Design a binder for this molecule. Structure first.
Ligand SMILES: CCCCCCCC/C=C/CCCCCCCC(=O)OC[C@H](COP(=O)(O)OCC[N+](C)(C)C)OC(=O)CCCCCCC/C=C/CCCCCCCC
Ligand SMILES: CCCCCCCC/C=C\CCCCCCCC(=O)OC[C@H](COP(=O)(O)OCC[N+](C)(C)C)OC(=O)CCCCCCC/C=C/CCCCCCCC
Ligand SMILES: CCCCCCCC/C=C\CCCCCCCC(=O)OC[C@H](COP(=O)(O)OCC[N+](C)(C)C)OC(=O)CCCCCCC/C=C\CCCCCCCC
Ligand SMILES: CCCCCCCC/C=C\CCCCCCCC(=O)OC[C@H](COP(=O)(O)OCC[N+](C)(C)C)OC(=O)CCCCCCC/C=C\CCCCCCCC
Ligand SMILES: CCCCCCCC/C=C\CCCCCCCC(=O)O[C@H](COC(=O)CCCCCCC/C=C/CCCCCCCC)COP(=O)(O)OCC[N+](C)(C)C
Ligand SMILES: CC(C)CCC[C@@H](C)[C@H]1CC[C@H]2[C@@H]3CC=C4C[C@@H](O)CC[C@]4(C)[C@H]3CC[C@]12C
Ligand SMILES: CC(C)CCC[C@@H](C)[C@H]1CC[C@H]2[C@@H]3CC=C4C[C@@H](O)CC[C@]4(C)[C@H]3CC[C@]12C
Ligand SMILES: CNCC1=CC=C(OCC2=C(OCc3ccccc3)C=CCC2)CC1
Ligand SMILES: *[C@@H]1O[C@H](CO)[C@@H](O)[C@H](O)[C@H]1NC(C)=O
Ligand SMILES: *[C@@H]1O[C@H](CO)[C@@H](O)[C@H](O)[C@H]1NC(C)=O
Ligand SMILES: *[C@@H]1O[C@H](CO)[C@@H](O)[C@H](O)[C@H]1NC(C)=O
Ligand SMILES: [Mg+2]
Lengths: 983, 268
């Protein structure tokens, strides 16, 4: 396109001039055909829409349906003169209130996360420089039009997509738009076919690091590369989270069980003699009863606790559902430049004394340092310190050297920081050697030179330091410094130099040659007139000091984080827009490519065979570049991914990152994407969990991501994986605890309807159990520690390992819940018989018991009871059933602490939150029973102490049964007991 | 999911074992529950309830009992016998259980104080109960007036106190029925009642009640309140309370405890 186009073919397409520029009238009229040079702001969801979305979800919709059923049943009963219709209203109000309060909590979490994220969002207007009708005036960037001729200089943002017409030493920072870590030279010659890899196109969002350039605006606003990436990301749909899918499956299980029980007991009520309307009301009551009121709040609170624990590590989630995706993740598609690496060129390797040394590249200097005890090292340090014009900003002593700011080249910055870290006081050392002559890094010479004077006042020599390309310093440098000696070149040192340079280049690093020359005082006395244009000083016959290479190195915690993720069974794929050699070197450095794993190119080079003659299955590693990825179809991409465990994608466009993520997801995996730049925003949006760096990340990446790492710490990924697995297990335990008590809440109603006993448990006391006494114990299970090494297990199978499954449901409902129902009914009949109502008399008693016209109903002793006295006895039954459920739930919370381990191994009291929750539950039970006014306010009665003792053997039975079940599971793995009785 | 080899994700043999496990579990749990109920019933006392927590003061009922919307509501027409035929029929049915034939299982009592029986000396290991026949209600007894005063606008209402095992109303004087207007019609006098038995008392030898096992023939003593000055074509509210030392009628959550309140209207 415009890069593949001469100025003759330009200058007419846009009706402009290469030097005069667009006319001031044509530009004004073009700003009407095309809008301002600015990206379109995103769609924008209003706050009420955000809150309404919080008011939705699978459990929320189930609760809405339950409340609607409650109101419909209320209407049906009111069309029949029923009395106990306040229960329907209470249930509907409770369900709606729980949904609304949980939605408010979630919306507040979203709002706070947005506030913290936008806190670090920087804002500033941007200018430009345009030459219209000859006048080179300064204009705002958004007034630019396609065809405008603009000028760029170092430190200015590129104002738009520009075809470069003239440039002098112009370099651009493309690390955010592309993956290129190194500064990219911009020249008006069309180099590559595509505009993304050519040298004559500068991009809208990028930085002009150095030099000056001039060019023609070729795209504007949303037609720029970054605007098109924004458009591509806007069209990416955000799919459901794994925890949301699990919740939906659990809601389906609840609905199925509710419908089954409702239909069964509807048939039973019809066969017993109930009218059709009454049987339908019974069906509706059962269906509503199967819906747990407090479970939504419990799940929300547990997710919020996990989010708080993550935020304690500077890891902020934008929604509460994102705290589990990392635990469920099996593939991490990671960006390289700026995500795995520091996006900062630093000195990594040195070749002096015929040996390759390794420098400490971590930003906190937490690594090892090379041997600095030598004389060649001192000479090399002097050469690289003196032959440097970069300087730190004044007023920098708190900031560490890697994170200081210096004015100069990227390579000069790396050399200055290396000198400051090794020698210390680089600027003072350089000023202690006054400079009398210098030669900048011109293109023809391809080296930088400077002559200095030694620090001691007794050595009148002049030192000439020269830094440049390796195969431009080697054409000079007849001598080489090794172990302080000045041995000359015997072609053996040339072979060694070539080998070292080739190895460092193959390591994806930029190498620089350094040398010194001690000018003689006899030939060059002090005060010598050194002329840059006369070549009066010796520019040949130098002494080579050493080779220094630079790379964009990984962050300090990245290699350990990658190793931990791979230990957890997560596949790590590198996907970068950077060059393949650098990508492969970084992948080997961080552990994405393991030691000893080879590509087909590596095997071919080792076996001296062509690339087409090597078995692909023999290569564990693979590097696929963007052009190859263009030709491969989904079948070949799937085959490559499933053939090579250690995969690296280099020169990958944002669309291709999205394609790779989509392929991994289509293979059935839960995919995490970590990125910082705009080039991974579509991939971050498509990922099941998107993680963006807080400091290095672009605004588009941070908007696309669900997780933000505020400190740019990659180990937070392993923290999130561990927390997600822990929250999955603890949510399983908490849901089992919550579901257990539903059966003892429902069975009294079933017996009330079918056997016609007086109502053993009321709606108000059921609501108290659901929303007051058990929420805290259920939440306390989120603090349970892992029962095994959770970080050494594989990721769960999303289709086979559900959050709630048949063993959990069956156990919690029909074994522990059955025991709780039996305890409640034992207490009910004990309290009834000790007040004068034997069980046989209780059977079939409901019509007389509830008859308001019967004021002398006879009990088992012949005593006559009024309706009010019978109602107080009914409230006593409510209270004893409530207390039975409470004690059995204490036992239940004790047994739900572990799924395989014994309580005697995990620790009875090591969960202090759980102990406090048990005490809190008992205290509220006592308060409800024995507070004055409770019988007429909440229908709780001051029950006798033996009503407390009756359910205690059943609670002990629950504990002993669970202990025996888990002992059988531990002692016989893989047996029938393990397959059927383990959840 | 339903498949021949695997029926809802489980083979037929495995379904058998899991169903057998659940059957055994529920059989054991039902056995434990039945044993608990058996132990409870073997610790329950046949004659005296363990606790009387809900029975502190006895309830009071009225015959004939006709309930309107919020409670007892009796309305009839003197000119129309079909309005009180049902009321008199209810009274006759109630007093059917108070004939001497119905009372052959009880004894004559002349003590006028507590019938305190510590042993079982009535036949079939039973305690004695006193007779209350429908002749102690004299005029309101149904003879020689089979209308119970309803025909002549002076209806008789039988007030019965709920029986509680071992409850003692108070032996200083016999518990006594007092009937009055709730809010007296300001245009008329206070309610004029005259009672059967005289003074509207329950004799103290009907207490204590020992329960239906010890006293299978026990009959609650009755008091008939004949109202003599109820205004015609007007709604009145009558409250009949029990005056005993250990009977209270101030509970605001049970309007039948210690008293009975009904609306009355006699049209002409
Ligand atoms: C779970 C975390 C919170 C998330 C949800 C937040 C909201 C939860 C609240 C739900 C209740 C719904 C809103 C109120 C609906 C009922 C309003 C009402 O009118 O109700 C009245 C009744 C008693 O009326 P009455 O007999 O006096 O009227 C006599 C009148 N006649 C004669 C007609 C009967 O009251 C009742 O039903 C009481 C019903 C029992 C529920 C009350 C709320 C208890 C919630 C406690 C949660 C505390 C935080 C969690 C624990 C902390 C550690 C984490
Ligand atoms: C899915 C699994 C469901 C399992 C359901 C439960 C199955 C078991 C149910 C009934 C079996 C009989 C249990 C009771 C028998 C106990 C043994 C016995 O021989 O006792 C004797 C009593 C009669 O003594 P008496 O009063 O004449 O003596 C008076 C003594 N003096 C005079 C000294 C005071 O016989 C009696 O009471 C018989 C009472 C029969 C009716 C009891 C009330 C029915 C209510 C049942 C609700 C249970 C819900 C369970 C929830 C499970 C959820 C999974
Ligand atoms: C975990 C700890 C939580 C602590 C919560 C915060 C502290 C608040 C607790 C207590 C402060 C108030 C204490 C009660 C007032 C003094 C006692 C009193 O004045 O007694 C007067 C008597 C009580 O009657 P009684 O005892 O003989 O029983 C009636 C028996 N029966 C069957 C025969 C009719 O006359 C009556 O009935 C009238 C009594 C009227 C009701 C009194 C006011 C207290 C009731 C409700 C306030 C809010 C409680 C619920 C809070 C939200 C849910 C957690
Ligand atoms: C409260 C109510 C309690 C009522 C309980 C009644 C249920 C009766 C349970 C009967 C146990 C049956 C049993 O024993 O199944 C033995 C199986 C054998 O499997 P396999 O190796 O041949 O399968 C490998 C071959 N393939 C893979 C083809 C399957 O499983 C094994 O041996 C593995 C270990 C099993 C032994 C420990 C658990 C069994 C104990 C059950 C009693 C639970 C209640 C205890 C008393 C109440 C105290 C609270
Ligand atoms: C875990 C740490 C727990 C720390 C303590 C928690 C708070 C305890 C504070 C106060 C409770 C005692 C004061 C209230 C009761 C006396 C008021 C009254 O008068 O009750 C009287 C009955 O009382 C009693 O039979 C004995 C008193 C104590 C009863 C049990 C107290 C509950 C204790 C539970 C602890 C369980 C620990 C083991 C399980 C958990 C293991 C981890 C009620 O009179 P009534 O039924 O005869 O009236 C009937 C007439 N009608 C119905 C018209 C009113
Ligand atoms: C109580 C009566 C009426 C119920 C009807 C009898 C039959 C249908 C009952 C009795 C025992 C029951 C089984 C007990 C155990 C399990 C294992 C659980 O993981 C799934 C349900 C399942 C498979 C139940 C299915 C229904 C079942 C087979
Ligand atoms: C018969 C009475 C006592 C009630 C039934 C007892 C039940 C719980 C017992 C008796 C026989 C037992 C089964 C015997 C056979 C098998 C197959 C074996 O591979 C695993 C154990 C398993 C699956 C047992 C499960 C539990 C079992 C069904
Ligand atoms: C999560 N468990 C909550 C519940 C457990 C058991 C429940 O029984 C239903 C019930 C009642 O139905 C009333 C009702 C009728 C029709 C529709 C909805 C509700 C009434 C009194 C007591 C119990 C209701 C709710
Ligand atoms: C019923 O009472 C009314 C007055 O309310 C009276 O007019 C009527 O005569 C009485 N009944 C009959 C039909 O005699
Ligand atoms: C009870 O006593 C009365 C009065 O003495 C007597 O008339 C009556 O016959 C006795 N009971 C019987 C046998 O009906
Ligand atoms: C009761 O009946 C007698 C006649 O046996 C009569 O003298 C007396 O007045 C009546 N009392 C009342 C108020 O009915
Ligand atoms: Mg990047």
């Amino acid at each position: 396109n415009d890069h593949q186009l001469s100025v003759a073919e330009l200058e007419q397409k846009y009706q402009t001039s290469a030097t005069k520029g667009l006319s001031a009238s044509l530009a004004a009229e073009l700003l009407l055909r095309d809008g301002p040079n600015a990206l379109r702001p995103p769609r924008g969801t209003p706050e009420y829409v955000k809150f309404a979305r919080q008011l939705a979800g699978g459990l929320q919709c189930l609760m809405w349906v339950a409340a609607a059923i409650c109101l419909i049943a209320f209407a049906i009963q009111a069309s029949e003169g029923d009395l106990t219709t306040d229960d329907n209203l209470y249930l509907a109000l409770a369900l709606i209130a729980v949904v609304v309060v949980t939605g408010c909590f979630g919306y507040y979490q979203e709002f706070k996360s947005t506030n913290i994220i936008a806190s670090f969002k920087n804002l500033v207007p941007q200018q430009a420089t345009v030459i219209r009708d000859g006048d080179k005036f300064q204009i705002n960037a958004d007034q630019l039009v396609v065809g405008d001729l603009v000028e760029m200089k170092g430190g200015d943002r590129v104002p738009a997509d520009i075809r470069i017409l003239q440039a002098q030493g112009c370099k651009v920072d493309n690390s955010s738009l592309t993956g290129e870590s190194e500064p990219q030279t911009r020249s008006p010659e069309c180099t590559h076919e595509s505009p993304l890899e050519t040298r004559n196109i500068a991009f809208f969002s990028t930085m002009c690091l150095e030099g000056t350039a001039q060019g023609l605006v070729v795209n504007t606003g949303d037609r720029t590369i970054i605007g098109r990436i924004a458009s591509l990301a806007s069209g990416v749909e955000n799919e459901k989270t794994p925890i949301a899918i699990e919740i939906e499956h659990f809601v389906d299980i609840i609905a199925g069980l509710a419908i089954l029980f409702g239909a069964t007991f509807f048939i039973v009520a019809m066969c017993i003699g109930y009218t059709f309307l009454r049987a339908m009301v019974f069906f509706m009551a059962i269906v509503v009863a199967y819906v747990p009121e407090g479970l939504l709040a419990t799940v929300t609170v547990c997710l919020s606790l996990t989010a708080k624990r993550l935020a304690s590590k500077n890891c902020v989630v934008k929604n509460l559902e994102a705290v589990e995706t990392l635990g469920s993740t099996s593939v991490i598609c990671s960006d390289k430049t700026g995500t795995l690496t520091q996006n900062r060129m630093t000195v990594s390797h040195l070749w002096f004394d015929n040996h390759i040394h390794s420098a400490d590249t971590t930003e906190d200097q937490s690594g090892q340092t090379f041997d600095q005890s030598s004389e060649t090292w001192r000479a090399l340090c002097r050469v690289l310190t003196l032959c440097n014009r970069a300087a730190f900003k004044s007023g920098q002593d708190a900031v560490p050297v890697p994170k200081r700011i210096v004015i100069g080249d990227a390579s000069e910055t790396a050399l200055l920081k290396f000198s400051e870290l090794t020698l210390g006081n680089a600027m003072g050392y350089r000023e202690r050697f006054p400079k009398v002559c210098e030669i900048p890094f011109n293109s023809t010479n391809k080296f930088q030179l400077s002559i200095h004077t030694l620090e001691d006042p007794r050595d009148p020599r002049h030192v000439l330091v020269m830094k440049g390309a390796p195969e431009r310093v080697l054409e000079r440098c007849s001598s080489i410094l090794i172990k302080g000696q000045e041995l000359p070149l015997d072609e053996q040192w040339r072979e060694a130099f070539q080998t070292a340079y080739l190895s460092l280049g193959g390591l994806g690093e930029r190498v620089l040659g350094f040398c010194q020359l001690y000018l003689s005082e006899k030939d060059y006395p002090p005060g010598y007139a050194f002329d840059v244009e006369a070549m009066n000083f010796p520019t040949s016959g130098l002494c080579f000091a050493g080779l220094v290479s630079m790379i964009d190195p990984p962050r300090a915690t990245v290699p350990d984080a990658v190793l931990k993720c791979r230990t957890a069974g997560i596949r790590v794929i590198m996907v970068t827009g950077d060059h393949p050699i650098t990508a492969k070197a970084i992948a080997a450095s961080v552990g994405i490519i393991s030691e000893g794993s080879e590509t087909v190119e590596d095997i071919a080079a080792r076996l001296r065979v062509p690339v087409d003659q090597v078995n692909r299955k023999d290569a564990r590693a693979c590097v696929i570049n963007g052009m190859q990825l263009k030709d491969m179809d989904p079948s070949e991409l799937v085959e490559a991914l499933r053939t090579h465990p250690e995969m690296v994608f280099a020169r990958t466009s944002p669309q291709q990152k999205l394609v790779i993520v989509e392929s991994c997801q289509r293979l059935g995996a839960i995919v995490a994407v970590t990125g910082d730049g705009v080039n991974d925003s579509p991939a971050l949006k498509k990922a099941d969990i998107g993680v963006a760096m807080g400091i290095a990340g672009s605004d588009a990446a941070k908007n696309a991501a669900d997780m933000i790492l505020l400190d740019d710490n990659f180990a937070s990924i392993v923290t999130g994986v561990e927390q997600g697995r822990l929250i999955f297990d603890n949510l399983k335990k908490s849901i089992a605890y919550t579901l257990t008590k539903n059966i003892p809440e429902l069975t009294p109603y079933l017996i009330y309807i079918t056997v016609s006993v007086p109502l053993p448990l009321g709606c108000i006391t059921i609501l108290f159990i659901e929303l007051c006494t058990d929420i805290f114990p259920s939440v306390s299970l989120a603090y349970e520690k892992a029962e095994s090494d959770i970080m050494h297990l594989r990721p769960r199978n999303p289709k086979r390992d559900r959050l709630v499954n048949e063993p959990l449901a069956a156990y919690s409902y029909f074994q522990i819940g059955a025991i709780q129902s039996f305890a409640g009914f034992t207490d009910y009949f004990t309290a009834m018989a000790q007040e004068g109502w034997f069980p046989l008399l209780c059977v079939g008693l409901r019509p007389q018991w509830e008859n308001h016209h019967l004021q002398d109903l006879q009990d088992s002793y012949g005593q006559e009871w009024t309706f009010g006295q019978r109602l107080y006895q009914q409230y006593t039954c409510y209270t004893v059933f409530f207390i039975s459920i409470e004690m059995c739930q204490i036992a239940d919370v004790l047994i739900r602490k572990t799924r395989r381990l014994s309580a005697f191994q995990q620790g009875f009291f090591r969960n202090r939150i759980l102990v406090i929750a048990i005490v809190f539950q008992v205290c509220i039970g006592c308060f409800l029973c024995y507070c004055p006014g409770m019988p007429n306010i909440f229908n709780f009665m001051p029950i006798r102490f033996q009503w407390w003792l009756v359910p205690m053997p059943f609670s002990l039975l629950i504990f002993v049964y669970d202990e025996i079940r888990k002992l059988g599971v531990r002692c016989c793995p893989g047996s029938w007991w393990d397959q059927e009785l383990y959840y | 999911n339903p498949d021949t080899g695997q029926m809802l994700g489980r083979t037929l043999s495995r379904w058998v074992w899991i169903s057998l496990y659940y059957v055994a579990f529920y059989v054991v749990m039902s056995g434990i529950f039945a044993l608990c109920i058996y132990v409870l019933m073997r610790t329950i006392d046949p004659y005296t309830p363990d606790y009387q927590d809900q029975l502190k003061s006895p309830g009071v009922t009225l015959r004939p009992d006709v309930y309107g919307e919020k409670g007892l509501d009796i309305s009839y027409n003197v000119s129309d016998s079909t309005t009180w035929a049902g009321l008199a029929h209810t009274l006759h049915r109630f007093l059917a259980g108070y004939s001497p034939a119905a009372q052959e299982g009880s004894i004559n009592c002349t003590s006028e104080k507590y019938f305190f029986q510590e042993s079982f000396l009535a036949p079939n290991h039973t305690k004695f109960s006193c007779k209350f026949t429908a002749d102690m209600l004299q005029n309101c007894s149904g003879r020689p007036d089979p209308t119970f005063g309803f025909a002549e606008g002076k209806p008789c209402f039988i007030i019965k106190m709920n029986r509680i095992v071992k409850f003692l109303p108070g032996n200083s004087t016999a518990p006594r029925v007092d009937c009055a207007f709730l809010d007296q019609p300001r245009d008329g006098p206070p309610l004029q009642v005259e009672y059967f038995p005289a003074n509207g008392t329950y004799s103290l030898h009907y207490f204590p009640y020992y329960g239906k096992k010890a006293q299978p023939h026990y009959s609650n003593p009755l008091v008939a309140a004949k109202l003599l000055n109820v205004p015609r074509n007007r709604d009145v509210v009558i409250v009949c309370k029990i005056l005993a030392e250990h009977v209270s009628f101030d509970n605001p959550h049970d309007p039948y405890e210690g008293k009975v309140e009904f609306k009355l209207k006699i049209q002409k």
